[PDB]
Scaffold this active site. Sequence first.
Site, PDB file in Angstrom:
ATOM      1  CB  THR A   1     -61.448 -39.041  -7.418  1.00  0.00           C
ATOM      2  OG1 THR A   1     -61.624 -38.015  -8.403  1.00  0.00           O
ATOM      3  CG2 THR A   1     -60.250 -39.877  -7.840  1.00  0.00           C
ATOM      4  CB  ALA A  49     -58.773 -31.851 -12.327  1.00  0.00           C
TER       5      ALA A  49
HETATM    6  C1  LIG Z   1     -61.815 -36.673  -7.962  1.00  0.00           C
HETATM    7  O1  LIG Z   1     -60.857 -36.387  -6.948  1.00  0.00           O
HETATM    8  C2  LIG Z   1     -61.403 -35.785  -9.152  1.00  0.00           C
HETATM    9  C3  LIG Z   1     -60.019 -36.112  -9.708  1.00  0.00           C
HETATM   10  C4  LIG Z   1     -59.576 -35.237 -10.875  1.00  0.00           C
HETATM   11  C5  LIG Z   1     -58.201 -35.678 -11.358  1.00  0.00           C
HETATM   12  C6  LIG Z   1     -60.511 -35.259 -12.067  1.00  0.00           C
HETATM   13  N1  LIG Z   1     -61.453 -34.386  -8.809  1.00  0.00           N
HETATM   14  C7  LIG Z   1     -62.305 -33.528  -9.347  1.00  0.00           C
HETATM   15  O2  LIG Z   1     -63.146 -33.815 -10.159  1.00  0.00           O
HETATM   16  C8  LIG Z   1     -62.261 -32.127  -8.832  1.00  0.00           C
HETATM   17  C9  LIG Z   1     -63.037 -32.202  -7.517  1.00  0.00           C
HETATM   18  O3  LIG Z   1     -63.156 -30.831  -7.144  1.00  0.00           O
HETATM   19  N2  LIG Z   1     -62.790 -31.152  -9.800  1.00  0.00           N
HETATM   20  C10 LIG Z   1     -62.026 -30.223 -10.403  1.00  0.00           C
HETATM   21  O4  LIG Z   1     -60.822 -30.117 -10.181  1.00  0.00           O
HETATM   22  C11 LIG Z   1     -62.650 -29.266 -11.410  1.00  0.00           C
HETATM   23  C12 LIG Z   1     -62.912 -30.101 -12.691  1.00  0.00           C
HETATM   24  C13 LIG Z   1     -63.503 -29.457 -13.956  1.00  0.00           C
HETATM   25  C14 LIG Z   1     -64.690 -28.479 -13.752  1.00  0.00           C
HETATM   26  C15 LIG Z   1     -65.346 -27.765 -14.998  1.00  0.00           C
HETATM   27  C16 LIG Z   1     -65.707 -26.291 -14.676  1.00  0.00           C
HETATM   28  C17 LIG Z   1     -64.681 -27.838 -16.401  1.00  0.00           C
HETATM   29  C18 LIG Z   1     -63.272 -36.525  -7.429  1.00  0.00           C
HETATM   30  C19 LIG Z   1     -63.678 -37.575  -6.398  1.00  0.00           C
HETATM   31  O5  LIG Z   1     -63.380 -35.263  -6.760  1.00  0.00           O
HETATM   32  C20 LIG Z   1     -64.311 -36.485  -8.554  1.00  0.00           C
HETATM   33  O6  LIG Z   1     -65.647 -36.297  -8.095  1.00  0.00           O
HETATM   34 CL   LIG Z   2     -61.113 -36.690  -3.963  1.00  0.00          CL
END
Ligand SMILES: *[C@@](O)([C@H](CC(C)C)NC(=O)[C@H](CO)NC(=O)CCCCC(C)C)[C@@](C)(O)CO
Ligand SMILES: [Cl-]
Lengths: 200, 233, 216, 196, 202, 234, 213, 239, 123
Positions: A1, A49
């Site tokens: 993110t 998320a």
């Molecule tokens: C972001 O911080 C991103 C922001 C979020 C609002 C989408 N965070 C994530 O993608 C997090 C990082 O662990 N992932 C999750 O919460 C799980 C998401 C879905 C997983 C599947 C099993 C459906 C970044 C920088 O971390 C994105 O890379």
């Molecule tokens: Cl992050």
Amino acid sequence: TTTLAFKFRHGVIVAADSRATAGAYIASQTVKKVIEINPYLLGTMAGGAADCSFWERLLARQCRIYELRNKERISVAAASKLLANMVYQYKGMGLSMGTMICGWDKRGPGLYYVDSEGNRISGATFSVGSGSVYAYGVMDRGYSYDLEVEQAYDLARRAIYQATYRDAYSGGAVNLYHVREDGWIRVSSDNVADLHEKYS
Amino acid sequence: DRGVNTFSPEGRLFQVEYAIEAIKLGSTAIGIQTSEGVCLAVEKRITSPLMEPSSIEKIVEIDAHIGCAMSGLIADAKTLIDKARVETQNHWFTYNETMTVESVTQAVSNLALQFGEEDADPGAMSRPFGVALLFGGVDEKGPQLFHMDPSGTFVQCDARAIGSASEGAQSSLQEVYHKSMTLKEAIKSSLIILKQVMEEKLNATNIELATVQPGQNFHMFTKEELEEVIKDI
Amino acid sequence: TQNPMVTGTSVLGVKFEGGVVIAADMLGSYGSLARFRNISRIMRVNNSTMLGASGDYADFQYLKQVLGQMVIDEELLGDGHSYSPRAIHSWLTRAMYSRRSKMNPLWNTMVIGGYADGESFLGYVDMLGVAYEAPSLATGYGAYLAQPLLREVLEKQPVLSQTEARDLVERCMRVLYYRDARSYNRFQIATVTEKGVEIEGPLSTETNWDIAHMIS
Amino acid sequence: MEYLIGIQGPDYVLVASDRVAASNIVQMKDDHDKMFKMSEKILLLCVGEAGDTVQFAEYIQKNVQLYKMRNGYELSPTAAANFTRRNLADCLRSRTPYHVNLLLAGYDEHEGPALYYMDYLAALAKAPFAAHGYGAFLTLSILDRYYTPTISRERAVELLRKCLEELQKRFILNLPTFSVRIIDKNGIHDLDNISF
Amino acid sequence: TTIMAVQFDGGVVLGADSRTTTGSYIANRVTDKLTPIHDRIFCCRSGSAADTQAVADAVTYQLGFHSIELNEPPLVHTAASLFKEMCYRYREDLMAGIIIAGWDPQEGGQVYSVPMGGMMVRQSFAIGGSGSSYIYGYVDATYREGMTKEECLQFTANALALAMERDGSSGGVIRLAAIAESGVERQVLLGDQIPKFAVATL
Amino acid sequence: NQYDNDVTVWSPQGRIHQIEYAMEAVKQGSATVGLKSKTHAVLVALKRAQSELAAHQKKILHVDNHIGISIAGLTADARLLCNFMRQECLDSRFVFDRPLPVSRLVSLIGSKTQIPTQRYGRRPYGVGLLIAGYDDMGPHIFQTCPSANYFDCRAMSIGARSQSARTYLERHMSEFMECNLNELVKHGLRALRETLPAEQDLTTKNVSIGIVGKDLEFTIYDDDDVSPFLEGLE
Amino acid sequence: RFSPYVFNGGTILAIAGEDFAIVASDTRLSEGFSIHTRDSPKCYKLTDKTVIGCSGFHGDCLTLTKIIEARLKMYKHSNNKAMTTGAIAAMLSTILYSRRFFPYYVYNIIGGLDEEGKGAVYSFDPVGSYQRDSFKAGGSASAMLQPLLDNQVGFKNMQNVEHVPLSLDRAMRLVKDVFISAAERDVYTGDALRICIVTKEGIREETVSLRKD
Amino acid sequence: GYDLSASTFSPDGRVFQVEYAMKAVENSSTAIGIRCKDGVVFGVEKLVLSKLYEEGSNKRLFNVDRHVGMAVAGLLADARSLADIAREEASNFRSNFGYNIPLKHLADRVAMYVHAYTLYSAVRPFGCSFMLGSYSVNDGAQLYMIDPSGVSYGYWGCAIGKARQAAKTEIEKLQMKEMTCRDIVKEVAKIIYIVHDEVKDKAFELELSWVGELTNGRHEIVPKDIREEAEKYAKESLK
Amino acid sequence: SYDRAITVFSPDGHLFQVEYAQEAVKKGSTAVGVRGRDIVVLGVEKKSVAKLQDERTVRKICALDDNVCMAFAGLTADARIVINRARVECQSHRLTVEDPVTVEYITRYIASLKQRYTQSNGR
Ligand SMILES: *[C@@](O)([C@H](CC(C)C)NC(=O)[C@H](CO)NC(=O)CCCCC(C)C)[C@@](C)(O)CO
Ligand SMILES: [Cl-]
Ligand SMILES: *[C@@](O)([C@H](CC(C)C)NC(=O)[C@H](CO)NC(=O)CCCCC(C)C)[C@@](C)(O)CO
Ligand SMILES: [Cl-]
Ligand SMILES: [Cl-]
Ligand SMILES: [Cl-]
Ligand SMILES: [Cl-]
Ligand SMILES: [Cl-]
Ligand SMILES: [Cl-]
Ligand SMILES: [Cl-]
Ligand SMILES: [Cl-]
Ligand SMILES: [Cl-]
Ligand SMILES: [Cl-]
Ligand SMILES: [Cl-]
Ligand SMILES: [Cl-]
Ligand SMILES: [Cl-]
Ligand SMILES: [Cl-]
Ligand SMILES: [Cl-]
Ligand SMILES: [Cl-]
Ligand SMILES: [Cl-]
Ligand SMILES: [K+]
Ligand SMILES: [K+]
Ligand SMILES: [Mg+2]
Ligand SMILES: [Mg+2]
Ligand SMILES: [Mg+2]
């Protein structure tokens, strides 16, 4: 993110990537990380998320109740404070959230950083997320309070772009918003692959 | 003296019957449901020219699609209104959709007989609410007006008056209402009726009026918009 | 239970035309010690339903007490409704899940057999609330040693007679006695049909030790 | 990482604090204020764990203001310091401890200027000068070297500036600007930021 | 500890060693591990001394009250059930391996094991405690259906003596009790009265 | 008199006036009828409208796929009891994965509603229910009262002028078990119609119908959907 | 250390069309290196317009689906209408988050029709993060299925191809192909493929055999 | 006035609220129990207040444990509440002590619960009396009766409700100690028909249950054919 | 804890405790307010005079916060409770909103406190 925001003469710019990850797996390239709290207030999402979505949705509920009870728009200060007070009780329990609350109220353009560690701070510019360090470099070298509107859009878009390039965990599209005195507008959604073509 | 949960020989709760009599001490309010929207109109009942008329609020927004007019002991209505607001926001939070007018009315009506002095928490409700309510709004069923009283009975009405002159007003409503009536006709009809029943000469500061339409969110009429409608009436 | 104490090994079950058969040895082990050598690990629940349990025996006795009392309570009403095998299996799933979710499991894996309304029922419930139905089941080492033989027979012939299911269960019990170091050669077989639940035992398998002279 | 300093003279208390809010490898704000006005003649300077710091200071602030509204007059610096201490100490062994380090500066009509030091354990000490943070390790000896109890307010600002210049020279963290305030008989005065 | 009880036609025999240990220090060399719960119901205690004393006291209280209320002698099965309920419910906080034995007019001589974990099973004879490991073979080879009271007493004394020789954690004297309709008869085997089996020298 | 204000005060005749008064709340509600055949259970209700411009109060409520109710008396008490019933049904499906038998649900109502009749400062429930259901023992009609008593019925009517409906139902009840669905609902409607003043008739505005049976989950018919049942009362 | 979780396998998939939704899953239920049963589908009918696929810890799958079923009836009772696909998705998000500190170990995908009659897919993480998707794979073999769908349904990395609407017939062919490919490589995916097709006419069911090793 | 609360004695030492509750039982139709050589038999005169009710509605005979029957008179919602208390007490006893509750102990425990509702302004006394019956090889046949004051005694024969005295005088004519359950059912039916006032209350159902050697110590409804024969015997004996 | 219903309806819809509370107010010293253009003024009667009174200790005009004050008429002990409750609430508002209360906000708070004491058991 990677997410960023900045205050300037013409309001506040807000931008984000659209990638979600589970470890190193890319879970989505189409996540909306800017949440519409009301027509004059946006929240941004970085970290877990589910955590960001839940607590910002609850913030939106509370702001709307506030509006019905008091017969006026909640200030950016008060909205960011509600969010801080909600998450403070959960410190140490593993919430992961980094948000910017972006609006325009009686004190003019408003921008607060709020996180699950308990921080709440006002400021001119912020970037949040794993790619923030990369966004800060480009945002910092181009930022000015007196940016013209189109120059401000260009800067935000470019800073998120450059973050997506270096940071394995940022990517997808860059989504850009502008908070103006009469409300926020959605300004553009640009796939990073199309921006790559353009910036070379 | 007897307890608050005592039945009379006719099978009614004394406290509820007495709360219903308190509604008759309230100002008159009127609701009309048309295919083009609902309107809510209420007599303010100004008791001194020193009082600020805009501080009398007997019509309130519940949510963008739902308003509420009240009559009776107005202070009692505050917790009911707040419960309605909180419930519609909870429903939005949970389900990402607007709550129906019927559902809002039902949620509020489940508070009605929650009083008594030896089941409940250290200082729970000691008596029923001395309030009647008209909920007017628009949902996927179209425009809708519901009435609720202190018994917790609620029902949809095509047109309804509540408060001091509701007999009277209800009779004129039977006379003028028709299913194909326009909103603008309904607005005029309710001001004509308020004008008859009010002790004071009707004007643009001693009444309130609001609408909700399929196009458009809850809207309180301004002084200037009331004056326009008052010309014909 | 955080730490199981006296425990039972495998329970087997198989559907047949007109019923279900389950089997379990009569041993409560205390670690490796074959300590209580004449205990029943099978319960008649009601006329249509039976239950066999692996794992902690005290936890099994508790379930037997609770479930026994529930059937009695229901019979007192005399109202023409009885718990079906499927209902009992559902209740058990809820109870185990609930205890798992309090971090205080009942340390058992169970096999519920029944017969109601012309249908054979056979269901599994474990200590975490994992539950399902199948034409044959086997807990513990039975999952590795017995279930392959049950399923291979069932693929060639999905509908077994009572006597075929009984012979197949005896062959599985023999294998388990050869290869599970917590088994014991004294077992019960329980059967449910139209007529109700019958528990037979104590039973033993014949064994063959010819291979003892085939080493040099 | 956060620096607080206080210097008490004959009829005033001078205080300063860095203006950085940091997170991981970045400064996220360079105009941060670590001072909380409790009353006309009382400042509380608060550093420590995120969330705890603001939550604790604002709670103390609201209660000091409440005391004024209830009674018609203000708590003294010493009473406010002891109130602050009672709250911190009472939370120490609770489910909600606050991990904060503080200075309390004030001026009392009858007792004159006061500077109080408190750590997260809630030990309370009155001092003629004091400091918190890693930066304290490099500046307390400069204060011991040059402080005298009759120090004028000009010289206190010079002494302060020696301390802050030492952080620029010798401290590994980038703390380029500081808030400066003074308290005396006439209340709380903002001085110019000291910046590099 | 080693504990044992055996059923005969008309009653039961119970037995225990008399050693209480902390690590390998003997804190009591003449412990009484057979505790009366009612007129003709005893328990043999193994595991934690604190736990088994607390539990035995509580069950004595419950059973006593129950018995006065019913106006009848209590069932041996009732005593065992009360132990079981407490040992099962508190299985994570107790270290208790119990034998309940006694006589009642309805079912005669009965032996119940309540091992750690709090299961309950009736048995012809029961052994428990850490020393019991060393006598499983002995009891399995020597037990005969239909033993008299006097034979149960010898069988018990022999089993206990063998356990006490081999288990560092068991020893001292052998306490025995016989329970029948006519009452309770207690005795102690000490020194030369304890059954003796040679060390197998070359 | 000194005996009529508290549900905890027995009169010298062995009566509890507060319970009797609560029963008057049901006698003054609008009439409802319940009846059954071998295969279906039906509820029929007259709805009272306050004015000519009001909808008409709901009288029939869904409890579960296999159970519905008709109410008479205090509406708020009806909802509280209906919510209790719904929850008991949900619990049974959650735990046992099967419908709660109708007679067990009615027992739970009896037990719940008895409690406040014996404690100071509490009151009886001022509602009577007709309960239609279908389970393994076939169709059921039960009646519940503010006394916490309940009854298993071949058919029943409660509310204002329900004596007339009951007289019709006794007259024809030997026919009910063998009726097809249409015949059975017609019988319900004719019984309910006996409760009306001679001037007035059953209409699509004032009749509400509930049906459950072997092949049919509990379904409510109102407004234009009752017309099929009202035409051919010939 | 009693662990309250175990992994039971399962692969799920949903695809949104212009007037249909597909929800598909394999029927193997596993634990460790063993098969519990070869006939345990991971799809559950919620309404006439909505199906949910659930994989992960089977104890949680069972509990969560029973909770959802109770909640759908509670909604219908209080509001007098069936829950929409979108409202089920929003509600599930809150149910998952209520266990934020002891999660349901379940990957959920909802497939159904939205209020305009169009295909809708919603995908979830175990603690209730979700969004609407055009198509989505979940569970044990999701990393095997997802890229091919990105390419073939999303047209990603392809030049000179018309971006035509997805027909039901082609969507069906893709679903069978990707599970067949997954059954070759994921040890947990096998036995049979169960496909539910949601349209305005209702929900129908196809089953296809997969490798049993 | 001295009769409004169970926490108030009258000047003569009476508790009128308990007496008033007894009057509710005495307005009820009659239930009887008879202990005999090998069991206990219950009979109830069950007034049918509407022909619209199902046969079986408003049972006054309950199973409270597999070996224990209960027969009631008075306010029926109160009686059902007591049956649930009796059931919980039997269940809890089995869980705690591990065997079937002895009848006498069950009677005493429920009687103390009834008694607890006779001390306080906060609650009212139960408007019901009930009989408890069981049989086992060890304890023999037992029949207890409990009234609204919480008094509990054992009986050879017992009657409660409005024709109590007339029933008792007929029960006294039987040598019940030497008769079997099969003999006694006919005599129970006979006695109900005798004390039934056929002019004043028009229609009744006879309800019968038993527990004894012949049911293996399980409390059970009398089978339909045996009930009908007992009714036919009772009716013809009335003649 | 004492849970008697104190404020109840009577026939005709009266709440007698509330009517009697209003009788208490009518026997209090007169208080007057006027809203100016850019000033607001409060004045109050008396109450007793009495030369030996310390005047400071009996004022009927009270600061709630810096930008809000109040006068009352009626039971002075009751007023002290209401005033202190409102003073606490002004500090919560500042704490969570970072603005002073509007006059309408704190009024609405005081009014709903009063309303609650007409509908709660034991009070
Ligand atoms: C972001 O911080 C991103 C922001 C979020 C609002 C989408 N965070 C994530 O993608 C997090 C990082 O662990 N992932 C999750 O919460 C799980 C998401 C879905 C997983 C599947 C099993 C459906 C970044 C920088 O971390 C994105 O890379
Ligand atoms: Cl992050
Ligand atoms: C017995 O199990 C014996 C039985 C007991 C009921 C007397 N248990 C013990 O002696 C136990 C240790 O197992 N000892 C205690 O509970 C300690 C009591 C005193 C503690 C202080 C001295 C610290 C055998 C086999 O364990 C005896 O060795
Ligand atoms: Cl996007
Ligand atoms: Cl608010
Ligand atoms: Cl800030
Ligand atoms: Cl009205
Ligand atoms: Cl054994
Ligand atoms: Cl069994
Ligand atoms: Cl000891
Ligand atoms: Cl043990
Ligand atoms: Cl042991
Ligand atoms: Cl031991
Ligand atoms: Cl020793
Ligand atoms: Cl009604
Ligand atoms: Cl009502
Ligand atoms: Cl009744
Ligand atoms: Cl009626
Ligand atoms: Cl009597
Ligand atoms: Cl309050
Ligand atoms: K030894
Ligand atoms: K595979
Ligand atoms: Mg903390
Ligand atoms: Mg211990
Ligand atoms: Mg394989």
